[PDB]
Ligand binder design. Structure first.
Ligand SMILES: C/C(=C\CNc1ncnc2[nH]cnc12)CO
Ligand SMILES: C/C(=C\CNc1ncnc2[nH]cnc12)CO
Lengths: 263, 266
């Protein structure tokens, strides 16, 4: 103690706040660029007739703009397909809609969200029905009903098994009315532009290399349910902490960063 | 009056100025990055795709719908490189003639031109104008293509609005650009130029005027690329001569340097 204790607190606050700012900013930049991609698919795939976007073009553009989406492992576009359209859709694409868990031909469902365009980094998503995973399905529904960006809870991503969160933006047909109801949004839905925030790897890359990292313990929690906080980043451990604010841009979810010293 | 109160007065000026500088720098950075994406969009969807997916109508729609991604820009446009040998061909295909910026008159013979072929509707008056026919624009085009990176002009009064602003340009290259290109190779491989108008006078005023304490403070931004010839980029004025603060700005072009100066009104 004691003047040194005060300085120690001031360092913790500064360190934590800066990390939180860095993470919030990189998230925001990624979300904004994903929004632009949703707009691109709408403009080029739906407003233009015939469509003037395809897998080759989507892959090239997304590869070349990967720098615009720093915390994302990849982006993809899933198209809305209702069951009566499935035969026609599968014949057009020359593949069958598959389940996420086993890659098996999808059983009949009322509707599906198969990935038709993908960044090569997530090429394994192609033809998978994004509604066949619960976190993804919930995201898709809330995206299309709200008309805005949505985030999942943290969960382990396909292929890598890295802990992350999925971001989804809805893409609508031009038949969407102005000031639409939710019912109108659903009817006008074309598909879903998604991005995978690979927190486990890419947030570790962001924060783990920073000076002072060995002196502090950093966690990011999804606190959407205050009684059931979910680890998004950091270890599973349950005196002096500091809470730094995070806002990842989906009002349905809440997050915070907590930092502590080791000793 | 108080000496103690004066220290706090300076502390507040520093904080207010530094915050405004950060905001300006960050918003410009966001705009530069989204202009970079547009240059990639033109390369991928107009040049690489056979046939092109971008006509004027498509460019206008996409850029209108994404205007929010580019906060300090009044408009974006794409100018294609046209060498004189090709001019008659280009004009016949487009069904219009390349015009000068100063009078919208048919361009005289020049070695090359940079006519705008795609434009956000906000800068629709740029269509068919040779961007090499304005000196600030011409210098920007050359440095963009030679360096391969984003470039900014000195402050000048923009077309139509006459607002004081700066122009941002990214080069677009042909697929023939070699890896690790020389400058000579970059010039030979140039397709055109994706430009954006930073309307500093209107849009920086809009940004600053909404902030709490705006009436208490005077904010000026200077282009200090030439130390002995500072150029006003933003600002007018009745200001407190006894105290000022300088805040750092980095707008992303190593060829240019800038700073912000804030003072109290009184
Ligand atoms: C294409 C869409 C979402 C992307 N979701 C995923 N993207 C990448 N990896 C994953 N693993 C589990 N889900 C994902 C549409 O919302
Ligand atoms: C299209 C290009 C630049 C855009 N330049 C301008 N864009 C809009 N207003 C202006 N006034 C003078 N120059 C401009 C290419 O570098």
């Amino acid at each position: 103690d004691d003047a040194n204790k005060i300085r120690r607190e001031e360092v913790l606050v500064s360190m934590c706040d800066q990390r939180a700012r860095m993470l919030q900013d990189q998230f925001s930049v990624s979300v904004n660029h994903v929004h632009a991609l949703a707009i691109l698919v709408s403009t080029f795939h739906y407003h233009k007739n015939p469509s003037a976007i395809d897998q080759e073009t989507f892959a090239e553009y997304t590869a070349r703009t990967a720098f615009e989406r720093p915390l994302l492992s990849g982006v993809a576009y899933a198209e809305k397909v209702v069951n009566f359209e499935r035969e026609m859709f599968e014949r057009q694409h020359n593949w069958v809609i598959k389940t996420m868990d086993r890659g098996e031909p999808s059983p009949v469902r009322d509707e599906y969200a198969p990935v038709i365009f993908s960044q090569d980094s997530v090429s394994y998503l192609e033809s998978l029905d994004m509604m066949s995973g619960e976190e993804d399905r919930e995201n898709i529904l809330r995206a299309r009903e709200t008309g805005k960006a949505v985030l999942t809870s943290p969960f382990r991503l396909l292929e890598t098994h890295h802990l992350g969160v999925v971001l989804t933006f809805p893409v609508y047909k031009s038949s969407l009315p102005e000031n639409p109801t939710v019912e109108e949004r659903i009817a006008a839905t074309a598909g879903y532009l998604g991005g995978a925030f690979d927190v486990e790897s890419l947030v570790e890359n962001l924060l783990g290399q920073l000076a002072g990292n060995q002196a502090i313990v950093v966690h990011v929690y999804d606190i959407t349910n205050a009684s059931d906080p979910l680890v998004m980043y950091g270890n599973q451990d349950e005196s002096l902490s500091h809470e730094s604010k995070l806002d990842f841009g989906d009002p349905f979810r809440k997050h915070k960063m907590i930092c502590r010293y080791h000793q």
